[PDB]
RNA sequence: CAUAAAGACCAGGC
């Protein structure tokens, strides 16, 4: 505890019945820290708080709370000879006793998740097989991933406009860093069958937000080329590939490049159209240029020229273009609710208000009954308080202290019906809409499998050498 | 060298160094580059010996 | 062509089979000058 | 077999919304006034940028996004600019365009913010909303910007960067005289801003010769027109479009046999 | 001197400490010196 | 890729008519109309003022697919009586509607300032 | 996640 | 990364509020109270600029290409 | 050679060895980068269909999460860790002894 | 080695004699579209640019023809290449040499993909016939491909990101068996269990049941807007079922005018009592059920998955039967139709006013379990006494944990019933379960009462350390709380020692459904 | 028009 001839990292197990003491001090061993209680209050009094939340300008941290001896790292083998209590105010009080001679505590309950499931807000109210379908979804929602993407050269990088934090957070959000680097969008979301587009797992979108920003993003390549002696008569060389010197001259349009045989930064550059002009000479040349992909448009954004290891010359072209959500694309909740784009109306056809708040995103109501996901319907109730309080609310796993009807009591003070529902009218004929749609705010991604990078057609192209048939991808 | 680590370029540094150096203050570490890629090692499950 | 060096960012034109590197600074990243035809968007 | 008299009533009248009353009239004829309110009425936003330098940190056809997005002053002279596909002349012309531009060079050390300011027109009658300040990008010590946008004229069935109006309220029948929608447990849901109950009752007494009347309105605006101008323009164009129906709908019957 | 039922402040400031002084990659950091610092010797 | 521009649901194109009339054929006086590049809008303008004639029995209106622009209006009236003459009607009817609107709404809005 | 007899 | 101009669902310009908000915030104000000043009184013109992210600030600690 | 391929032995033994360590770092989002420096392995092949080393056990309580673990054919074998969990780094045992 | 490339999947047999890569062939995304017949299905513009059809050239369509040559590879509805008697092949992608561009009898077209051919669609894994079937070209502007809602159920489909094929006949005498032999009308119901396999299943059978009661009266106007939507209509306005005060129909009125012919059919519903058709009210049926289609008329009952579904004799096999396959299609199409019309009207949603029951509920979902756990305590107490006598067949445990779960399996089904009986009519969680579209009832149970009890192994959570579960219990520990009864809801949230288990339970259901089909996939290939 | 090899491993989608 006090740490005088033993490091911190040992585990000392002994098994009462096998008579025996085992000590490891081995690495490769995991473990995590926890509370130490005595005869039976815990150790960390109030004097290590008060001198806890000044770690500025006092000189007191982490480390002097486990050489104080009040938390202790403990690992697997040896939480089989401890008995835990999960929480102090309610586990270690005078009652009818279970048990009543504990040895540790936790911290918070709620550190037993890992990165990607402290994203979800009310783990507790999901199916457990959503839990795992969003956390692996959350690793390719498309946001801003580094503060340097300008410098940085990647291949294939997504970056969105215009993200937002979200309105219902855990508290574990504030300890990997996602309200400096989040990835998408609070939006209004209305859980109601429409028109029939939304049925099976899609999704209505507002086109008139589309129209301003809402789910934009822009989309970076990059190409390398390199210059390179292969042979005593043969030679690779940046040089802008004329007609009657060069062999190999076919229909892409060679005028954009430069003298440097490289494009300038600025014109856009439409399918099969040469991006870097490199030739061989011939063992009187003949061109290895490289080409863009398949319908492409986009813009030249920056060229790096430079040398390699070896002492060649090296470039790196990075290209932009920039993708606005249309009726294939894939969106998805924080809750396992994944759903393309199934069509895009305007404002003057959307579902609107008594005053005029159209819905972004129209889902439908039968992807909540079999699958269980009302930890999405209590961010969507939560939502809308946190957007008129002016908060933003709390949705750490297991509180007993943010109930239903305590939200429920803090919408019906801001005007609206305690059960979320509001009164829609309809946009193709402006008469009411008999049932109250489930109208409220929620944080949707933008995944990254897009429909113009799945479209596919074949009509008579090239075929393998060795069994003539046509080709593979 | 592991970015990030006591024998890199990088360690002990503000905000305003890593900046001037064009690499960002959040980026965690503990990765390598070999042949400009970024690699990283998974940690491999073993029985006790 | 022109090119901009990547630390003291002055403009050197290097010329075409030489190597890459500039002058007062001793650095071999280069990049290239913006182009000068003019693109026309839309704010659509 | 004929028409109805409906009856316009003002409640409140601002420099950013109408909240008016039309008495005895159809819910189609409301409904679609509702919807010539948004789509339909013409106003003058950006639609044709070309950038000459651009070494900010935003992309140039980001900035060009956010050029369409500001509102440019369309009082008076949007009934004398023509379509650009209505005018017969070159590729552009003063007649159906409003040239911009902006130059903005940051010297100093703090960082400088590119505004609506910055754009300067040559006709001054359109001009962005100035008399806050609409940011466009933020600048570094030795950043800078220029450029020449231009300016059409169309409606928000194109792009929502030409629609005139934020949130277009409207609502009928605030108590269920009508039951068009049921209420489950009407004790629960909060009584609307126009009705007429009592402290201790959920619903009006259902009727069945009822019939939708005496439609409410909230009309607001952005900044380009008048709130009152949304209006009758919607209106006139409207009638422009029943017009040219039965202009080439009774040249159809003319021309049947 | 005791901490009753303001445990909710006290929980997420000592959960705030240690990810102050660690961090999230301090397996990799640490077991990579102490690779180089001991084990090539 | 395939995304259409926004001038394909309200530009007519060089060739398609406004408007077209073909007898139906199922009930003796009743036609259909077929308006391009419309919308709800209108539609459902003209089928409300239509269901206020007493010599109309059936009117009525439908976008057949939404990513197109065309809207389809269906009206069978009694005999001795037309029904491209009940739609000119109708037609003549929203035009001195809207103008007696309008000037109510003008003369309203100038009532409404000094006092 | 029901009972033993219908499903995990 | 910057303020939307012309919030997606409204139409009202949020673009022009974001400096305000922050001068209202350092004072004593509340959130809810700062937005409230601003007249941004409907909810879909609130998480526009309660649950903005201010990336531009930091894209701006970075020397350009060109001195 | 061995960190740039992956195949963790020797260049002319490349079918004897254990691929599937040092693999290229995940750039998408933050929180997938954060996920993939922080990420167990264990080395049961991924055809066999014993149902005993895939499923979640009582001692994953707080130091390997139970939610995060991917889909189709490798499901609970590739684990990732908790927010607390500190994988040890190893001590000489010569003073306690 | 020459064994080695002529050895089993993907070698020479098993890879490029059977199986092979084939040319015009498409592939991408499936999103809905309701406006579509069943016989359809919609193509984008790009891919239907791009594949081709060689048409022969008669005197019968050469002005077409030649109108389709002067245009071509620049306007879309083209032709891309000429092909002569002699075999040869002049373009007209680039350099189209127009002094060349003159057609004769013998020669043929190479023409662009229009309005009306004959495909052939696909989705993988292809597990029996009904998973590949020709569906016919209509042509749409944006960047997927869209089929109907009906279709969905054959193909086992949904509109999450799937990619479906399309493959085109080329010969004239491969479009014609494709016509007469395997088009989407012809294979509604199937041989393998002689009912359809499709079903009006979605948001329209939700509509479709509460289009069909009592209360539904409709008015002037939307008898006149949903008369619109029906294709197979007489022109005749059906008199109304009220005359005065003011003229209203009703649902089954106009449900009556969709469904086609003189058929037959009596049904039931879901909600039909045991306890009524014995004795009175048997031909009334006070809650309108026990559904009587007759003479081609919906006289009674309220419609839902029963009447309407994928079973055996429905009214769309009854009227697959009699009628046809040419008319049950336009029954599909004008139901799903004229349903969604009514249902932008109606409307529909679920929110959280549909998944809580009142403050009498409640007490006594916590009376039967402190029952339940007051029990097994008496249970455990009695088998610490060396007094519990064993069962034939069974050891101690066995017994043990076998009553205990015939305890806590009793008392979960008691909470269940106290949720069922506690909804209301205007609830639309039981608006889904009742009407056969989506949910069950033990979704109703663990959304408002109790979640259950979770197992890994077939039996109740094990002791995965010594003695003890996790580390908070007591060693020896058999209680309900101690192994994984779940006794709260998804609403009132899980306390950490409860969602734990329940991780574990909801990951044994996900590595089976993981391993499954590698089993099934393999007996599936060696039967055929 | 013609030419862009091919194998091994890895991370993913339904
Ligand atoms: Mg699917
Ligand atoms: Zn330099
Ligand atoms: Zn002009
Ligand atoms: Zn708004």
């Known amino acids: 505890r006090q740490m005088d001839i033993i490091v911190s990292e040992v585990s000392m197990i002994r098994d009462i019945r096998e008579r025996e003491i085992r000590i490891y001090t081995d690495a490769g061993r995991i473990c995590r820290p926890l509370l130490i209680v005595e005869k039976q209050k815990l150790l960390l009094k109030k004097r ?33 000879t401890v008995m835990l209590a999960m929480t102090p105010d309610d586990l270690q009080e005078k009652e009818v006793a279970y048990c009543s001679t504990y040895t540790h505590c936790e911290i918070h309950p709620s550190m037993i998740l890992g990165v990607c499931a402290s994203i979800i807000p009310f783990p507790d109210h999901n199916q457990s097989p959503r839990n795992t379908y969003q956390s692996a979804m959350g690793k390719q929602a498309m946001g801003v991933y580094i503060t340097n993407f300008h410098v940085r050269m990647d291949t294939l990088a997504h970056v969105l406009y215009y993200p937002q934090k979200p309105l219902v957070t855990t508290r574990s959000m504030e300890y990997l860093r996602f309200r400096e680097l989040p990835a998408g969008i609070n939006s209004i979301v209305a859980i109601a069958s429409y028109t029939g587009y939304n049925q099976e797992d899609s999704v209505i979108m507002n086109r008139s937000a589309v129209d301003r920003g809402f789910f934009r993003s822009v989309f970076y390549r990059s190409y390398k080329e390199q210059e390179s002696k292969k042979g005593f008569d043969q030679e690779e ?37 040469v991006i870097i002009g490199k030739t061989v000479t011939l063992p009187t040349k003949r061109d290895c240029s490289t080409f863009l992909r398949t319908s492409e448009t986009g813009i030249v954004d920056q060229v790096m020229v430079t040398l390699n290891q070896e002492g060649y010359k090296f470039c790196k072209i990075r290209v932009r273009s920039v993708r606005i959500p249309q009726i294939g694309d894939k969106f998805a909740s924080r809750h396992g609710q994944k759903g393309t784009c199934g069509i895009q109306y305007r404002q003057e056809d959307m579902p609107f208000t008594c005053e005029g708040i159209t819905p972004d995103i129209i889902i439908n109501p039968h992807a909540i009954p079999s699958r269980m996901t009302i930890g999405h319907l209590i961010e969507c109730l939560q939502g809308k308080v946190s957007a008129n309080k002016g908060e933003i609310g709390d949705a750490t796993p297991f509180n007993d202290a943010v109930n239903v009807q305590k939200i429920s009591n803090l919408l019906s003070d801001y005007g609206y019906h305690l059960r979320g529902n509001e009164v829609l009218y309809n946009g193709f004929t402006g008469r009411k809409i008999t049932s109250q749609i489930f109208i409220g705010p929620t944080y949707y991604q933008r995944l990254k499998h897009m429909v113009d990078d799945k479209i596919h057609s074949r009509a008579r192209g090239p075929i393998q050498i060795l069994n003539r048939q046509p080709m593979e991808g | 060298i592991m970015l990030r680590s006591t024998y890199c370029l990088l360690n002990g540094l503000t905000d305003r160094d890593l900046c001037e150096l064009n690499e960002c203050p959040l980026d965690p570490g503990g990765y390598f580059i070999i042949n400009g890629s970024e690699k990283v090692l998974i940690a491999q499950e073993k029985m006790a010996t | 062509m022109i090119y901009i060096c990547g630390e003291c960012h002055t403009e050197n034109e290097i010329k075409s089979r030489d190597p890459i590197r500039c002058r007062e600074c001793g650095y071999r990243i280069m990049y290239k000058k913006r182009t000068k035809r003019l693109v026309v968007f839309d704010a659509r | 077999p004929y028409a109805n008299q409906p009856t316009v009533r003002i409640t409140e009248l601002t420099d950013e919304n109408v909240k008016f009353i039309i008495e005895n009239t159809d819910l189609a004829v409301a409904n679609s006034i509702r919807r010539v309110f948004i789509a339909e009425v013409p106003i003058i936003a950006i639609d044709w940028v070309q950038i000459d330098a651009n070494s900010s940190v935003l992309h140039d056809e980001f900035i060009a996004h956010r050029l369409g997005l500001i509102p440019l002053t369309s009082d008076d002279i949007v009934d004398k600019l023509q379509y650009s596909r209505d005018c017969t002349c ?56 220029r450029l020449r946008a231009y300016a059409k004229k169309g409606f928000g069935k194109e792009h929502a960067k030409w629609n005139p109006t934020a949130g277009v309220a409207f609502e009928y029948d605030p108590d269920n005289a009508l039951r068009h929608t049921v209420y489950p447990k009407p004790e629960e849901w909060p009584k609307s801003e126009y009705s007429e109950l009592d402290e201790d009752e959920s619903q009006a007494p259902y009727d069945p010769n009822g019939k939708p009347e005496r439609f409410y309105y909230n009309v607001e605006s952005c900044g380009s027109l008048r709130p009152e101008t949304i209006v009758l323009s919607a209106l006139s164009g409207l009638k422009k479009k029943l017009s040219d129906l039965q202009t080439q709908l009774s040249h159809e019957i003319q021309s049947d046999v | 001197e005791i901490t009753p039922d303001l445990w909710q402040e006290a929980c997420w400031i000592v959960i705030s400490s240690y990810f102050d002084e660690k961090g999230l990659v301090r397996q990799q950091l640490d077991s990579f010196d102490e690779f180089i610092q001991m084990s090539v010797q | 890729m395939n995304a259409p521009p926004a001038f394909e ?35 459902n303008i003209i089928k409300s ?43 003549t009817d929203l035009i001195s509607e809207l103008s007696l609107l309008e000037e109510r709404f003008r003369v309203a809005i100038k009532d409404k300032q000094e006092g | 996640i029901w009972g033993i007899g219908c499903n995990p | 990364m910057i303020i939307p101009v012309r919030c997606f669902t409204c139409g009202k310009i949020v673009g022009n509020k974001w400096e305000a908000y922050l001068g209202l915030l350092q004072a004593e104000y509340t959130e809810g109270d700062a937005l409230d000043a601003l007249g941004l009184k409907r909810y879909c013109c609130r998480r526009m600029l309660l649950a903005h992210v201010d990336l531009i600030e930091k894209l701006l600690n970075y020397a350009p290409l060109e001195k | 050679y061995s960190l740039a391929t992956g195949n963790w032995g020797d260049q002319k033994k490349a079918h004897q060895a254990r691929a599937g360590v040092s693999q290229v770092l995940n750039r998408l989002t933050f929180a997938s980068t954060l996920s993939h420096l922080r990420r167990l392995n264990s080395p049961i092949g991924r055809d066999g269909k014993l149902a005993k080393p895939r499923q979640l056990h009582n001692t994953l309580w707080g130091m390997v999460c ?21 994988i040890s780094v190893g001590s000489q045992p010569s003073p306690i002894l | 080695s020459l064994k080695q490339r002529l050895k089993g999947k993907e070698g020479r047999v098993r890879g490029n004699l059977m199986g092979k890569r084939v040319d015009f062939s498409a592939r991408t995304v499936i999103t809905p579209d309701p406006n579509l017949s069943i016989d359809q299905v919609g193509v984008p513009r790009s891919i239907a640019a791009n594949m081709t059809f060689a048409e022969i050239v008669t005197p019968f369509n050469i002005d077409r023809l030649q109108e389709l040559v002067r245009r071509g590879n620049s306007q879309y509805p083209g032709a891309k290449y000429i092909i002569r008697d002699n075999g040869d092949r002049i373009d007209l992608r680039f350099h189209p040499k127009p002094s060349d561009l003159h057609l004769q009898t013998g020669y043929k077209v190479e023409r662009h993909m229009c309005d009306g051919d004959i495909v052939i669609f696909n989705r993988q894994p292809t597990l029996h016939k009904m998973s590949m079937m020709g569906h016919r070209v209509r042509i749409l502007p944006w960047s997927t491909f869209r089929l109907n809602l009906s279709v969905t159920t054959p193909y086992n489909a949904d509109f999450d990101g799937d990619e479906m094929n399309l493959h085109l006949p080329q010969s004239l005498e491969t479009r014609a068996e494709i016509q007469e032999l395997a088009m989407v009308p012809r294979m509604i119901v199937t041989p393998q269990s002689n009912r359809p396999v499709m079903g009006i299943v979605q948001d329209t059978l939700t509509a479709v049941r509460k289009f069909t009661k009592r209360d539904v009266f409709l008015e002037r106007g939307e008898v006149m807007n949903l008369l619109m939507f029906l294709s197979t209509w007489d022109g005749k306005v059906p008199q109304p079922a009220i005359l005065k005060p003011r003229p209203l129909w009703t649902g089954k009125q106009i449900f009556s005018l969709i469904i086609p012919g003189h058929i037959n059919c009596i049904r039931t519903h879901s909600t039909h009592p045991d306890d009524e058709d014995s004795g009175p009210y048997k ?40 009628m046809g396959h040419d008319i049950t299609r336009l029954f599909y199409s004008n139901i799903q139709t004229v349903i969604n019309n009514w249902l932008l009207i109606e409307g529909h949603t679920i929110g959280i006013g549909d998944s809580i029951a009142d403050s009498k509920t409640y007490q006594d979902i916590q009376n039967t379990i402190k029952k339940a756990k007051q029990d097994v305590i008496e249970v455990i107490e009695k088998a610490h006494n060396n007094e519990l006598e064993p069962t034939p067949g069974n050891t101690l445990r066995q017994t043990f944990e076998n009553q205990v779960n015939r305890i806590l399996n009793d008392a979960r089904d008691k909470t269940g019933s106290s949720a069922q009986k506690s909804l209301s009519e205007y609830n639309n969680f039981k608006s889904m379960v009742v009407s056969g579209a989506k949910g069950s009832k033990i979704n109703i149970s663990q959304v408002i009462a109790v979640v259950g009890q979770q197992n890994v192994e077939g039996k109740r959570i094990p002791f995965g350390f010594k003695h003890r579960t996790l580390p908070h219990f007591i060693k020896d520990d058999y209680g309900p709380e101690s192994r994984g009864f779940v006794e709260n809801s998804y609403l009132a949230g899980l306390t950490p020692t409860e969602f734990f288990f329940h991780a574990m339970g909801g990951r044994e259901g996900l590595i089976d459904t993981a391993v499954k089909t590698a089993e099934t996939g393999y007996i599936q290939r060696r039967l055929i």
Not at chain 1, 237 to 258: N, S, W
Not at chain 6, 79 to 87: G, I, K, L, N
Not at chain 10, 294 to 301: C, H, K, R
Not at chain 10, 302 to 315: D, N, P, R
């Open chain 6, 49 to 91: 003022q239509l269901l206020k004639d007493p010599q109309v029995l059936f009117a009525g209106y439908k976008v057949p697919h939404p990513l197109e622009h065309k809207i389809i209006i269906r009206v069978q009236t009694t005999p001795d009586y037309s029904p491209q003459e009940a739609f000119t009607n109708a037609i």
């Open chain 10, 283 to 322: 031909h009334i049926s006070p809650g309108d059920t026990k559904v009587v289609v007759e003479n081609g008329e919906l006289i009674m009952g309220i419609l839902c998955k029963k009447s309407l579904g994928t079973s055996a004799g429905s009214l769309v096999h009854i009227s697959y039967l009699e």
């Open chain 1, 48 to 80: 290590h708080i008060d001198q806890l939340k000044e770690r500025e300008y006092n000189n007191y941290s982490w480390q002097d709370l486990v050489a104080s001896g009040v938390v202790e790292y403990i690992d697997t083998l040896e939480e089989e």
């Open chain 6, 9 to 43: 649901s309200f530009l007519l194109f060089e060739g398609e008519k406004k408007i077209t009339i073909n007898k139906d054929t199922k009930v003796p006086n009743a036609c259909l109309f077929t308006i391009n590049k419309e919308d709800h809008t209108l539609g």
């Open chain 4, 90 to 145: 070159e590729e552009f012309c003063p007649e159906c365009s409003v040239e911009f531009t902006l130059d903005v060079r940051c010297n100093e050390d703090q960082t400088r913010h590119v505004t609506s300011r910055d754009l300067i027109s040559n006709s001054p009658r359109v001009i962005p909303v100035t008399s806050d300040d609409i940011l466009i990008v933020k600048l570094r010590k030795g950043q800078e910007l």
């Open chain 9, 66 to 86: 139970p939610a995060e673990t991917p889909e189709g054919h490798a499901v609970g074998l590739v684990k990732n860790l908790a927010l607390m969990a500190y």
């Open chain 1, 237 to 273: 060389v940046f040089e802008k590939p004329t007609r009657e010197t060069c062999q190999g001259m076919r229909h892409a349009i060679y005028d954009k490049l430069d003298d440097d045989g490289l494009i300038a930064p600025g014109v856009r550059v439409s399918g099969d159209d």
